[PDB]
Amino acid sequence: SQLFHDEVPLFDNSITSKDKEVIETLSEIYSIVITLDHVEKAYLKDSIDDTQYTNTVDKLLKQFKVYLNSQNKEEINKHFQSIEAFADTYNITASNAITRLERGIPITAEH
Amino acid sequence: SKKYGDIALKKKLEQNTKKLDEESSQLETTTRSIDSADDLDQFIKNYLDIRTQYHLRREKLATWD
Amino acid sequence: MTDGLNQLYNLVAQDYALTDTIEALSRMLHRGTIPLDTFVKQGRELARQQFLVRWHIQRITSPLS
């Protein structure tokens, strides 16, 4: 009602230039996790083949690791850790969970 | 008075919505081939648009009161 | 509808639309309309945009600091 009177900017005055970088890297990590999931559903229902699925996923995971081990790595991983701890770790078996965890593979909600 | 209108207003807004959803899936069916970045770019921009306006009214309607 | 409240409605609208557009791109991949690499590039972009929209929503609807 009145609680939302004026339109707010993406980055208000409490945002430093470093936060912006952090947020952008997070948006990039977000895109990969989302894409990773769609590529898999794609493969699962035969839209692409073994190789395509494999080459693609590999490219993505590498760029992913790079986002977690580059500029502002400190802040970024703090956000990711809590993000992952909040993830809906369901429909994924503890069996598969360990495989992924050792492989550095992020959680991708498969519905 | 300033209450009977709502009924009809909802009705009209509710119908434009169904038309957008229709315009949505229609565009998708029509786009049976992309031969250039432009073509795809156009599709994405138009689909995304129709889709946004669709949800906007969609949420404006179920929140009418 | 205030200015801020209007914004909120559009941001939300954009979030859902962005998902719809990604999904649509998925069907185009499945139907053979577009190749994998195209889906990945476009999808990534739309998804990146989605995060930005959502984070924005969070900032607005947060206990303002």
Count: domains in chain A: 1
Q: Which residue of A has its CA nearest to C33?
A: A47
Residue type present at position B19: K
Contacts of C14 in chain B (CB under 8 A): 52
To test the contact with chain C by mutation, choose from A22, A33, A38 the residue with the greatest count of C C-beta atoms within 10 A, namely: A38
> What CATH number labels C1-65?
6.10.140.820
B17/B39 Cα distance (integer angstroms): 26
Q: Show the domain range for B8.
A: 1-65
Contacts of C24 in chain B (CB under 8 A): 28, 47
A75/A90 Cα distance (integer angstroms): 27
Residues of C with CB under 8 A from a CB of A: 2-8, 22, 26, 29-30, 36, 39-40, 43-45, 47-48, 50-52, 55-56, 59-60, 65
Experimental technique, in short, is X-ray
Contacts of B40 in chain C (CB under 8 A): 34, 38, 42
Count: domains in chain B: 1
Rg of chain C on CA atoms, in Å: 15
| Domain residue ranges of chain C, discontinuous segments joined by + | 1-65
Residue A26, chain C, CB below 8 Å: the answer is: yes
- For C15-26, the DSSP string reads HHHHHHHHHHHH
C25/B34 Cα distance (integer angstroms): 12
CB contact under 8 A, A8 and C4: yes
Contacting subunits of A (3+ beta carbon pairs below 8 A): C
Q: Which residue of B has its CA nearest to C27?
A: B28
Residue type present at position A99: T
Q: What is the dihedral of CA B49, B61, C1, C3, to 10 degrees?
A: -30
Return the axis-axis angle of helices C3-30 and B4-30, rounded to nearest 10°. Answer: 30
| Resolution at which this structure was determined, Å | 2.8
CA distances from residue B25 to A8, A45, B28, C10, C31 in whole angstroms, order as listed:
33, 22, 5, 21, 15
Interface A-C: count of C-beta contacts within 8 A: 84
- For B4-32, the DSSP string reads HHHHHHHHHHHHHHHHHHHHHHHHHHH--
Contacts 24+ apart (CB under 8 A), A99-105: A104/A61, A104/A65, A105/A61
CB contact under 8 A, C9 and B56: yes
B58: domain CATH number? 1.10.287.660
Instruction: Tell me how close the Cα of A73 comes to any Cα of chain C, in angstroms.
Output: 19
A98: domain CATH number? 1.20.1440.200
Q: Show the domain range for A108.
A: 1-111
